[PDB]
Amino acid sequence: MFVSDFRKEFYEVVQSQRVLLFVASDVDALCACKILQALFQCDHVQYTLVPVSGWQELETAFLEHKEQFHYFILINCGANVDLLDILQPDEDTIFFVCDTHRPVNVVNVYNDTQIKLLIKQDDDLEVPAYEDIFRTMRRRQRREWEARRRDILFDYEQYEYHGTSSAMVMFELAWMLSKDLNDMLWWAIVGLTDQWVQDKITQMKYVTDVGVLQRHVSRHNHRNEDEENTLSVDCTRISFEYDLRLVLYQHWSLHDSLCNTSYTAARFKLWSVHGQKRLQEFLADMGLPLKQVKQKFQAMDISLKENLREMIEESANKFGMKDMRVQTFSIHFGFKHKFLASDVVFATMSLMESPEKDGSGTDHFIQALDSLSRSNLDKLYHGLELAKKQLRATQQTIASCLCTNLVISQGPFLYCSLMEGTPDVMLFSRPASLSLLSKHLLKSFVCSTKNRRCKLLPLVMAAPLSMEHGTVTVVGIPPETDSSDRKNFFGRAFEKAAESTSSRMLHNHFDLSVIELKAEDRSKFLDALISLLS
């Protein structure tokens, strides 16, 4: 069932109870977890928090914890599968699901007693009616009904996508509880910006949600400040910004940010030998000295920093980059700490997807989660350093793939693969960073090629996972277009291709468009996908 009011029939229920949080390892999940943590700590709710990153891990943790806890909250996981089938719970347990994944599984939708969904009912949802999904001429009519059922269920389950941010949902709950702090609002903003950075949502939906959060920012600012008398410099001040699309440009030199932003790198073809000259054309059009552009931004001359955004916008317009400016937010506190929401997103993501072989992925999750609090600001800066390394490695990998021409058409989709032992393949072994790399690589490819048909294709990308088990991760990306809905069918396509091939596919990740394959299975699996997409 959908929860109609989070306050009464979710929060006031669990407020009297011991709770278990399962949280996915993504930045939106981390922000929603932080908001809910702060609420529970205000109300002395005895919660336990468990990270998870796949179905096997969630099943293991639930089997470990099922006896002691009756109330469970799943953040950014569980909505798009039958939780009762997967977990096999006792009937007295209750699962709250604040998950952005769409479409919601019909069993979770119509299970009234046990599965409760912390999902907005005014999100883009098209759930089929109950009578269409659940129960001689009567036999013929029944078989016709079953044919209708399979057709409508395939139409419902074909495309997966993402709804409103879980962090935004939790901040809505905090606002209804009248316990919303400025830091909670910042976590909500970072949660939305995670979806925008990873291209999980459309630009229109992102603009709408930014319009929602603008009102909350204005309310929080005018809560205790006006234009006549102001707060201490120590206090956090969140400001709406119509800022630049360039990544981490306030902590870098502008040259590095123009080099490693996927947008500008794809436009100017900076992987190519000619791309640096095109970048120099752009910089000379702006009139910025190269010794200033290659200097760190905080050390750049303030005469140049005065109107840099207008300069970059108006040069980008005539160079063909039509949407260089983006609606976003920034947070200021103290004298010297200034971050964009995209900066916090990249830092936390790099901490979580860090390639270091220390401890465990749960350890990297813990470092990422700690970095979202201002008492652990050093972790945030360290995450920014890791983001520098990650973005440089991303551009190196894209340059390698395009120069050696690993990205190759195979009919209805482009195909690419990373070989073992190549530079910085370890950084993209993990599925989430691989999905991000595939998106950036597809943007670079469609900006590079002259073939108008190839600009319309989706991308399938693979990389090694475990040589000892002989497995590869595989991800599927929809076509990269300006007006895409960011819906993709590769979940069901992978499932149906694997079933039609009897392939050894482990479906452990929460996105259905991310899978693990036994490596030798890839040839017949790819052939099946080619025959399927046709």
Q: Which residues contribute to the site for other proteins (CB under 8 A)?
A: 273, 277, 280-281, 283-291, 400, 404, 419, 421-423
Q: How far apart are the first and last CA of the chain?
A: 37
Which token pair is 23? 């949280």
- Tell me the CA distances in angstroms from 164 to 368, 405, 435, 442, one per residue in order: 22, 37, 20, 25
Which residue lies nearer to other proteins by CB, 287 or 320? 287
Asked whether 267 and 320 are in contact (CB, 8 A), the reply is yes
- Residue closer to other proteins by CB (options 301, 356) is 301
Q: Which is nearer to other proteins, 425 or 461 (CB)?
A: 425
To the nearest whole angstrom, how small is the minimum distance from the Cβ of residue 443 to other proteins? 22
Provide the 10 A C-beta neighbour count for residue 7: 14
Q: Under a CB-based contact definition with an 8 Å cutoff, are residues 286 and 248 in contact? A: no
Least distance in angstroms from the C-beta of 280 to other proteins: 4
Picking from 441, 461, 479, 478, the residue whose alpha carbon sits closest to that of residue 517 is 461
Nearest distance, CB of residue 526 and other proteins, angstroms: 22
> Nearest approach, Cβ of 317 to other proteins (angstroms)?
16
Do the strands 101-102 and 161-162 form a parallel or antiparallel pair, or are they unpaired? Answer: antiparallel
Strand, helix or coil for residue 453: coil
Task: Closer to other proteins by CB, 39 or 418: give it.
Answer: 418
Q: Record the tokens describing residue 492, joined without a space.
A: 């069901």
For tokens 């991800």, name the residue: 475
3-state helix, strand, coil in the chain (%, to 5): 50, 15, 35
CB of 403 to other proteins, least distance (A): 8
Backbone angles phi, psi at 517, to 5 degrees: -125, 145
Which residue's CB is nearer to other proteins, number 211 or number 423?
Answer: 423
Return the SS3 of 328. Answer: strand
Nearer to other proteins, 371 or 395 (CB): 395
Q: What sign for the dihedral angle of Cα 186, 189, 191, 193?
A: negative
> Residue 221 or residue 429: which is nearer to other proteins going by CB?
429
The CA-based dihedral angle spanning residues 273, 278, 280, 283, taken in that order and rounded to the nearest 10 degrees: -150
Peptide bond into 479 cis (omega under 30): no
- Shortest Å, Cβ 304 to other proteins: 8
The HSE-up count of residue 170 (CA atoms within 13 Å, CB side) is 36
- CB closer to other proteins out of 48 and 404: 404
Kindly state the smallest distance separating residue 273's Cβ from other proteins, in Å: 5
Give the nearest distance from C-beta 283 to other proteins in angstroms. 8
Beta strands (DSSP E) in 53-183 are 71-75, 94-98, 101-102, 115-117, 161-162
What is the total residue count of the chain?
Answer: 534
Q: Two tokens at 342?
A: 């995209």
160: which DSSP letter?
B
List strand residue ranges (DSSP E) for 214-349, in order. 237-244, 325-333, 337-340
111 vs 396, which CB is nearer to other proteins?
Answer: 396
Closest CB to other proteins among residues 293, 477: 293
In the complex, minimum distance from the CB of residue 287 to other proteins, in angstroms, rounded to a whole number: 3
Instruction: Output 49 or 286, the one with its CB closest to other proteins.
Output: 286
CB of 266 to other proteins, least distance (A): 20
Minimum CB separation of residue 326 from other proteins in Å reads: 25
